[model samples]
Target: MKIKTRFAPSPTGYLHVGGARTALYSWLFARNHGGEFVLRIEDTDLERSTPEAIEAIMDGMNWLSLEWDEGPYYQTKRFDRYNAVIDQMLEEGTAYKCYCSKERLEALREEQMAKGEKPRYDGRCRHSHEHHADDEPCVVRFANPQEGSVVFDDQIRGPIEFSNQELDDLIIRRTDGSPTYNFCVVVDDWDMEITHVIRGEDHINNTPRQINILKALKAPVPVYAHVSMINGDDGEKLSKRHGAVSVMQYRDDGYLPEALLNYLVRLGWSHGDQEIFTREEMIKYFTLNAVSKSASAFNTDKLLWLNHHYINALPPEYVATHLQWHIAQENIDTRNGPQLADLVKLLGERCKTLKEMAQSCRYFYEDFAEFDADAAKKHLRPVARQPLEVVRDKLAAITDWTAENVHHAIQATADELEVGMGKVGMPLRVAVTGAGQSPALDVTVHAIGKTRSIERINKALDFIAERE
Candidate 1:
């Protein structure tokens, strides 16, 4: 069978990491088999679903570059289709109106619980066909099979079964005549010709019910793969405190899309001993059979290490795309300094995240409002005044500005003053960058353009001379 898969997200909030990983699996499955991938918005909860939530879902998917080959069909927009199906089922005796009072259902539920029985609809309206005609208030319920069991081979978890006795007739349409979540899901999947159903294990119980509904409708049932949940490091479900937030928050927090997706794909799936996979490698290596049936812990260290790996391996210009947003966040005016791409090459290996790179490189773009006091006291000294002056004049006179030329001039100053290189370079580093740690003194000076270099040096020269 030609495989077709989908990512159906509810528009009630941002697309969490769990949802993104599900999308990734579905997306990869479709891509691997050359099948169509669909995006469906299961926005049936009108009260909680908002346009903002839809935007956030779209934003998260777009940020991850997960493209779909079919419609982004919204469940809310397909009420007419759902209504039509409900009518057909009712006419065929596969569904009947439920007029049971909520109070009566509650009493029955409490009695069942008291008797230590599972709470479910007793199907009071299963054969009440004539009662739906003049409905004071009613819901349409599907006629689930009275006997048999649901059996489907999950590519990841192997064969699974749910007995029909555990299943019950579900309300396909509420009293307000709107399609319910379970019914809508089955109809949409069938209509879209989805070949595989890959979702979280939380939906395992609902699967048997959906399969029965599809069976009653004489529709095809897709294969299922219910992935296990991701848990926190402490063995609890993944939550916001465990770094489970909106996907965009990762981007905002200075993560590369590639790194994030790479890390996500490895969370519960792996291909042999491989620890990293490019986009092509991901498609080539991803398979349902390799996914772990057990949950994977969220490791802040692993994600960060992957991010660090990507930052160091990616082309400087590529890394700058992410760095641009973060640098702007720090209010650093990158326009005045070395090309951001070049700066990234210089500083990327020095940081674990682009956010750190932005913060550390600020001195290259704009001098600190106040020099780091300890750095100034330690490196910029009255005794270093001669070396600072000597280096400043040599650097200002350099008609050619390059790291090599800058290095030569600094060495020339140290020798001209008959002192060790650190005595000269360290003080010069403090003067120009307004910080202690920097790249090689020559490269640092070259990155700070000749004009800014002369200005900052003169400012520091005044500090030392005044003290002397």
Candidate 2:
């Protein structure tokens, strides 16, 4: 049989990191085995599902580059198929209509709770002999075995067994004749010939009920692998309090797709002691056996570190492109400066995120409204004002204002003033950029261009003379 796998997500909201990991694993498994990977949207819950949520999932998946071989088969579109299966089960006597009212079911649940018993459906309609009229509102429920056990070996968590006694006759369709999630998912997976069902461990309890329904319908049960949950640093399940849990949120924060993929693959899944792997390496080495049974915590520090690693290793042009997009998004003007890629090459090492890089290099792109007061007071005092004026004059006379030439001019000015390089360079840095901390003074001035450099230097002179 061909090895087929699918990542099924309900289109309720943005694809969280946990769902993304499941998609990654399923995609990797199919790719590794030379089989097909499918993307199925389980939008059966129409009340909470939205088209926007579906688009977000698509965007997140595309960003991660987790390509699928088969559809985006939507469950909402396959209701006819589900209805056919439900009707077949009903005819075969393996399923029956449940006419129990909500009030009755609630009373039963309350009675069970008072008696200290698990409050599952009591199967009150299991053997109803009355033939219902065509207009009668009812739900369809599968007949579950009251004895024996359903057992399967999980690829990640090892052998798992559920007693049939614990199983209940679950609803397949509501009173409005809409098929329920459990029944719809099984029908879709079976019809698509999906060979593996890889999902989160939280769905473990639902497996036996689904399996029984599949058995009742004579559909083949796919192999199962339920991966562990991702928790927050507090050891609780990862949530909004732990920061942005959605994959797109990370993308919006300027994280590299490659870095996010690498970080996600390592969360609750690993290959020996390795912490980083390219997409190709991930496909070649990823396996279900390597997944941890225990939950993995969301470590923002580690994710930031990994992002910085990718940023540092990125080609200067690539980093610049990302930074430029971010700068434009911030509505900063970049038309008057050195090429962004060149600037990024100069300041890449000083940043961990694209946001950080953009913010740090803002002075290069636009003029600062106010100088750093402390830097100006300490470096642009009256004693240093004359030296700055002389240096500004010398710099204005030079035609080739390259980094090396700028350095030579500054050194000459410092020598003429009979002072060390710091006294001359620090004030020049503050004057040109309005900030003391920046790239090398020579490189910074050269990148700021000859005309702007002279203008900024003159402005600084005026500000200093007025202060004195």
Candidate 3:
């Protein structure tokens, strides 16, 4: 049979890290097998879904370059198809109307708990309910078999089985006639010809229910693999305070798509002793069978380490795509300064994230309102004014302009002043970059260009002269 896989995410919030990894795994499985990967938005939860949420999910997927072979098909757009199946199930006796009242179900739950029994629907309305136009509210439940076991081997989890008797008659349609989530998923998978269903482990209980629905409709049962959960560093559930959980939040936090994807692929899955994998390497090396059955820890430091590699390793021009957004966030204009790509190269390896790189590189393009007070006081003393002046004159005299040329100028300033390079370099760095912390003075000043470097130096010299 031809291989087909899909990532179906609900549009309730931003595409969080957990969902993105699921999508990555499913997309890779399809890619590795040369099969079609379908993108489906399970938007059946109408009350919480939003257009913004939908856009965010798509944005996250696209940013990761997880392209789909087919739709973005939405369950909300397939309600008619779902209702048709529900009606067919009703007529075929595989499903029936359930008119169990809220108070009645609650009372049953309390009594079952008092008897120390599992609270479950007693199948009161499964076989005896009659529909009314408006007199009684009703729900449609699938007729679960009273005996036998539902067995399916999970690709990642190995063989797993559930007793048929343990599951209750699941409601397929609500009182208002809206089809439920599990019912819609079965129909869509069957219709989409999905050969594999790779999702979170939380959906394990729903698997058998969905499979029974598929069997009742005489549709093919797709392959299933559920990946494990990711928890916080302290072994609790990952939440907002646990750092960025949303995929887009990582993007906004200055993580490159590659770094995030690489970190995610290894969170609970791995290939040998590798901590990094290129996108090409990922598609070639990924296998659903290799995913770990145990939950993975979310260590922000590990992710940041990987982010640093991506920042310093990829071509500056390529890294500039994401840096552009961060620059915009800081409201820095690029019309007059050196290319942002050059700044990326100069600023690379000195920082951990694009956000940090962008903030640090800002002074290369925009003039600072004033030097950082402490940095200025320490580095801009009257004694250091001569070196700052000499470096300014030497750098301005250079006909060649590059990182190398910039380095020579700063060195010449120290030699002429008969002072250690730190005296000249530290103060010059403070003058040009607005802070003492930055890349090497030469590389930093080269990107600052000769003209502005001299101008900012003149201002720092004037500040020192005014002090004494």
Candidate 4:
């Protein structure tokens, strides 16, 4: 049979890091086997799910480029199919109406707690020949076999078993006549023909129950792989305080999509000692057997490290594409200055994120309001006056504003003044950038243009003269 896999995310919140990993794994597994992958939105929790969340999930998936071959199918849209299956189960005696009241169930729960036993439905209605009015409020539950244990081999976790004695009859339809989450999942998987189920470990308990329902319906049971959860560095549940924000938040925080995806793949799986894998390499090397059985800690530092590596390793044009978002965020206009690709090439080595790169290169695009105070105080002094003047004049005379030409002009100015390079370089650095810290002064000046560089030098000369 042809293998198929799916990423079924409930749309109650933004797609966070954990969910993205599962999606990545499923996508990789499907792509590796030449199988199809589906994107299903389990938005049955209508009270919490919102259109905004569905859009966010799509945005996250698109940003990561985890393309699916089939739907974005939504559970809410398949209610008719789910109810029809429930009706069939009820007729075949595979399920029965559960008319137990809330008060009685709560009292049973209290009795179980007093006896120090697990609270469960006692299957009071399963064998009853009694009849109830059609209008009577009721729920439908699967008539789980009372004899044997449910068993399935988890692709990552190995063999797992649950006793029928421990498994209670699970409600398939609610009192409101709508199907519950687990039942909907079973029906969807069977209908959609999902051959592999890759999901978080939290759902490990649900697998046996879902398998039973599939067997009762005489449908194919998919392969199950229960992946471990991700915890924060503190070993707590991942939350905003631990950098477990929306996948888009990482983008807004200036992470490239590829970097985030790479980091996520490594969080739970690995191939030898490889620290980086291209998308092609990922597909080639991925296997469910290699996935770690234990939880992986979410490390922001490692993510930043990967982000930095990608910024430096990717082509300037491609990096510039993601960099454009950060540049726009800073409202820095590139039309008046160097090309974004040029700036990315120059600034990539110094920045860990695109946002940092954008902010750092701002002065290259626009003039500063004033000189950095200490830079002006120490470098823009009386003794430095002549060097600034001679360099400014030499820089202005040069029609070719390449870095090499700019370097020659500054070098010649120092040569004529019989002084060291820093005597001329320091004052000029402060003049153009209004700060002591900058990239190589020659390259920086060339990028800032001969016009703006000369203008800023003149401003520094005025400041020095005024101070004297």
Clashing pairs in 1: none
lDDT of each residue in 89-117, candidate 4, tens digit only = 98898998888888898998899989998
Assess every candidate by TM-score: 0.95, 0.90, 0.91, 0.95
Clashing pairs in 4: none
Number of the top lDDT candidate: 4
Lowest lDDT sum, 10 consecutive residues, model 3, at 127-136
Question: lDDT (0-100) at residue 122 of candidate 3?
Answer: 79
- lDDT string, candidate 3, 345-369, tens digits: 7777788899987786778788888
Off by over 4 Å in 4: none
Q: Score each candidate by Cα lDDT.
A: 0.86, 0.84, 0.85, 0.87
In model 1, the Cα lDDT at residue 236 comes to: 95
- The list of candidate 2 runs beyond 4 A from truth reads 99-104, 114-116, 122-128, 132-135, 381-386, 389-402, 415-417
| Cα distance off (Å), candidate 3, residue 381 | 6.0
The residue-by-residue lDDT of candidate 2 on 34-72, one tens digit each, is 999999998877776788888999999998889898998
Which regions of candidate 3 deviate over 4 angstroms?
98-114, 120-139, 379-385
Instruction: Kindly state the number of residue pairs that clash in model 4.
Output: 0
Residues 1-468, model 1: lDDT tens digits:
678999998774798898999999999999999999999997878766798888899889998999888988998888899999999998898887888877897898899899998877877788755544663877779998887788999887899998887788888888787778999999999999999989988988898899999989889999999999989889998899888467888988888999999988988898878898998889988889999998999998899989999998988898988889998889987778899889887887788888888888888888666777898788645567788777888887867778888887887886867778788888888888887899888898899888888899888877776553
